[PDB]
Amino acid sequence: CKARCQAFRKEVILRTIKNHKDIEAAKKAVYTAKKNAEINGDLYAEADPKLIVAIRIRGINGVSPKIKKILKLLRLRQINNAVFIKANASTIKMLRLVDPYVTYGYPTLETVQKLIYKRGALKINGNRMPITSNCMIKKALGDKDVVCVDDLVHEIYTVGKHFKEVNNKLAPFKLNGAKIAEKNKKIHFILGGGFGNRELLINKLLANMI
Amino acid sequence: SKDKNRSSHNQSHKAHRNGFYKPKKSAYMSTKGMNVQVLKNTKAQRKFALAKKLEAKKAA
Amino acid sequence: AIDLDRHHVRKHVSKTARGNNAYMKLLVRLYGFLARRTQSKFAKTILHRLCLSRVNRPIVSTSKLACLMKKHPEETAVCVNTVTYDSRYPVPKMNVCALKFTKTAEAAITKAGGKCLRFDELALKAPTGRKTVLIRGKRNVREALKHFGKVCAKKNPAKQYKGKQTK
Amino acid sequence: PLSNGRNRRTRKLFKRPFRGHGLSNTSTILHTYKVGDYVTILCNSSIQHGLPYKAFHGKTGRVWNVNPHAIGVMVNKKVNNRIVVKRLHISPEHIKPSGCQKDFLERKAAVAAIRKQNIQLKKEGKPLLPLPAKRLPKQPRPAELIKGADIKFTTVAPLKFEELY
Amino acid sequence: IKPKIVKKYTGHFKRFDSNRFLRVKASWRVPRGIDNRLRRKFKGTNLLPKIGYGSAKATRNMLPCGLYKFPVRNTTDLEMIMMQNRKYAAEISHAVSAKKRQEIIQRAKILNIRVLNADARIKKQEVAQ
RNA sequence: UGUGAAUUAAAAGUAAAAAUCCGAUAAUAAUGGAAUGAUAAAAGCUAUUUAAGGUAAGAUUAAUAAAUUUAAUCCCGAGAAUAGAAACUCUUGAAGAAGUAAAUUAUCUACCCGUCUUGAAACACGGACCAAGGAGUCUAACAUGGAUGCGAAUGAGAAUAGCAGGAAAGCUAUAACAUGAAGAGAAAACGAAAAACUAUGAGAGUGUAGAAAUACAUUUAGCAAUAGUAUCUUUCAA
RNA sequence: AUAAACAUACUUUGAAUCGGCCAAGUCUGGUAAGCAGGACUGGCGAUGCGGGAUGAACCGAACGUCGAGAUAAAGUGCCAAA
RNA sequence: AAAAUGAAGACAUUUUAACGAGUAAGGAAACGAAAUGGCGUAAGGACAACAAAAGUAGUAAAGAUUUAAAGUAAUUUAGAU
* Spacing of B28 CA from G15 C1' in Å: 36
Q: Give the Cα separation of C60 and C79 in Å (integer).
A: 8
CB of A37 within 8 Å of any CB in chain D? Answer: yes
Evaluate whether A15 touches A23 at the Cβ level (below 8 Å): no
Q: How far apart are CA A98 and CA A63, in angstroms?
A: 10
- Measured distance CA(E74)–CA(E76) in Å, rounded: 6
Contacts of D76 in chain B (CB under 8 A): 23
Using an 8 Å CB-CB cutoff, list chain B residues near A65: 12-13, 16
| Single-letter amino acid code for the residue at A76 | L
User: For the purposes of burial, counting CB atoms within 10 Å of the CB of C118, is it exposed (0-12), middle (13-18) or buried (19 or more)?
Assistant: middle
Contacts of A43 in chain D (CB under 8 A): 145-146, 148, 151
- Cα separation, D82 vs D77, in Å, equals 9
Which residues of chain A lie closer than 8 angstroms to C2, CB-CB? 60, 77-78
- Resolution in A for the shown PDB structure? 3.0
Give CA separation, E69 vs A124, E86, E112, in Å: 44, 12, 15
Q: Does C5 sit within 8 Å of A78, measured CB to CB?
A: no
Closest residue (CA) to C1' of nucleotide G46 is E34
Distance between D73 CA and the closest CA of chain B, angstroms: 11
Size of interface A-B (CB pairs under 8 A): 3
Side chain identity, residue C132:
T
Q: Do B15 and D84 touch (CB under 8 A)?
A: no
A26 touching D (Cβ < 8 Å): no
Interchain pair D151, A46: CB under 8 A: no
Whether C143 has its CB under 8 Å from any CB of chain A: the answer is no
Q: D83: which chain B residues are within 8 Å (Cβ-Cβ)? A: 20-23
> Looking at chain C, after which residues does the C atom sit over 2.5 Å from the next written N, breaking the chain?
none
User: Chains meeting D at 3+ CB pairs closer than 8 A?
Assistant: A, B
Is the CB of A73 within 7 Å of strand G?
yes
Helical (H) or strand (E) element with B4: none
SS3 D16: coil
DSSP secondary structure letter of residue A84: E
C78 to B33, C106, C128: CA distances (angstroms): 44, 15, 12
* Cα radius of gyration rounded to whole Å, chain D: 27
Residue of D nearest to B29 (CA): D64
Distances (CA, A) of A175 to A134, C46, D164: 23, 47, 53
Question: Which DSSP string do the residues of C41-81 spell out, in sequence order?
Answer: HHHHHHHHHHTS-STTS--EEHHHHHHHTTT-SS-EEEEEE
Scanning A116-135 for CB atoms below 8 A from B yields: none
- What is the chain B residue with the closest CA to D63? B28
Residue A116: HSE in the Cβ half-sphere, 13 Å Cα cutoff: 27
Closest CA to C121 of C153, C154, C96, C88: C96
Rounded alpha-carbon distances, angstroms, from residue D40 to C101, D37, D90: 61, 10, 11
| Length A198 CA → F161 C1' (Å) | 100
From the list C15, C79, C6, C22, the residue with the least C-alpha distance to C44 is C15
β-pair partners for A86: A51
Whether E71 contacts E91, CB under 8 Å: yes
Strands D144-146 and A43-45: antiparallel
Distance from C-alpha of C166 to C-alpha of A43, rounded to nearest angstrom: 92
CA dist list (Å): B52 to B42, B43, B46: 16, 14, 10
Q: What 3-state class would DSSP assign to C150?
A: coil
Cβ-based neighbours of D117, under 8 Å, separated by 6 or more: D128, D129
CB A88 to CB D151 under 8 A?
Answer: no
Helix/strand number for chain A, H first, E second: 8, 8
Per this entry, what is the length of chain C?
A: 167
Is chain A adjacent to chain D, meaning 3+ CB pairs within 8 angstroms? Answer: yes
Contact across the interface for D66 and B22, Cβ inside 8 Å: no
Contacts of B34 in chain D (CB under 8 A): 65, 72
For B17, the closest chain A residue by CA position comes to: A65
Distance CA(D92)–CA(D47), nearest Å, equals: 11
A77 CA to G20 C1' in angstroms comes to 32
Q: Give yes or no for C6 touching A (CB within 8 A).
A: no
Helix (H) or strand (E) holding C161: none
- Tell me the C-alpha distance between D50 and D32, whole Å: 20
How far is the alpha carbon of A127 from chain C, nearest alpha carbon, in Å?
14
**Cβ-defined contact of B28 to D80 (cutoff 8 Å):** no
- Which nucleotides of strand F are protein-proximal, with an atom < 7 A from a CB? 25-28, 43, 55-56, 66-69, 79-81, 99-102, 109-117, 120-121, 129-131, 142-153, 194, 196-198, 202-205, 212-214, 221-231
> In Å, how far from its chain's centre is CA D105?
12
Nearest Cα residue to C31 out of C112, C113, C122, C109: C122
Helices (H), E3-126: 75-78, 98-110
Q: Do chains E and B touch (3 or more CB pairs under 8 A)?
A: no
Give the closest residue to D90 by CA, choosing from D51, D119, D57.
D51
What are phi and psi for residue D162, nearest 5 degrees? -130, 135
Phi then psi for residue C17, to 5 deg, are -70, 130
Do the Cβ atoms of A80 and A54 come closer than 8 Å?
no
Comparing CA positions, the residue from C4, D138, D133, D134 lying closest to residue A91 is D138
Q: Specify the DSSP class assigned to residue E16.
A: T
Note which residues in 139-158 of chain D have CB less than 8 A from chain A: 139-148, 151
- Compute the CA torsion angle E14, E16, E19, E21 (nearest 10 deg): -130
Provide the experimental method for this PDB entry.
cryo-EM
Tell me the torsion sign for CA atoms C7, C13, C19, C21.
negative
Determine contact: A127 vs chain D, CB below 8 A: no
Contact in structure between C77 and C96 (CB atoms under 8 Å): yes
Q: Does the beta-carbon distance from B21 to D74 stay under 8 Å?
A: no
CA distance A63 to chain B (A): 13
Chains B and D touch (3+ CB pairs under 8 A): yes
Strands (E), A62-124: 81-86, 102-105, 121-124
DSSP codes, D47-88: --TTPPPGGGTT-EEEEEEE-SS-EEEEEEEE-SSBEEEEEE
Enumerate the β-bridge partners of residue C79: C98
Q: What is the SS3 assignment for A86?
A: strand
In chain A, which residues have their Cβ closer than 8 Å to the Cβ of D136?
88
Closest CA to A74 of A50, A94, A59: A94
Stretch 37-76 of chain D: residues touching chain B, C-beta under 8 Å: 62, 64-67, 72, 74, 76
Nearest to C2 among A63, A68, A78 (CB): A78
- In contact, E116 and E89? CB cutoff 8 Å: yes
Strand H: which nucleotides have any atom within 7 A of a protein Cβ?
Answer: 1-7, 11, 16-21, 23-24, 30-35, 49-50, 55-62, 69-75, 77-80
- Tell me if D144 and A45 make a contact (CB, 8 A cut-off): yes
CA–CA dist C105, C138 (Å, integer): 18
Asked if B17 has any chain A CB less than 8 Å from its own CB, the reply is no
DSSP code, position C2: B
Which of the residues B34, B39, B42 would you substitute to probe the D interface, choosing the one with the greatest number of D C-beta atoms within 10 Å? B34
- D94 in Cβ contact with D39 (< 8 Å): no
Burial of A197 from C-beta contacts in 10 A (0-12 / 13-18 / 19+):
buried
List the Cα angle B48/B49/B54 in 5-degree steps: 100
Sheet holding D71-78, edge to edge: D83-90, D71-78, D60-66, D38-41, D95-97
Specify whether the CB–CB gap between C97 and C122 falls below 8 A.
Answer: yes
Q: Does D151 contact A43 at a Cβ distance shorter than 8 Å?
A: yes
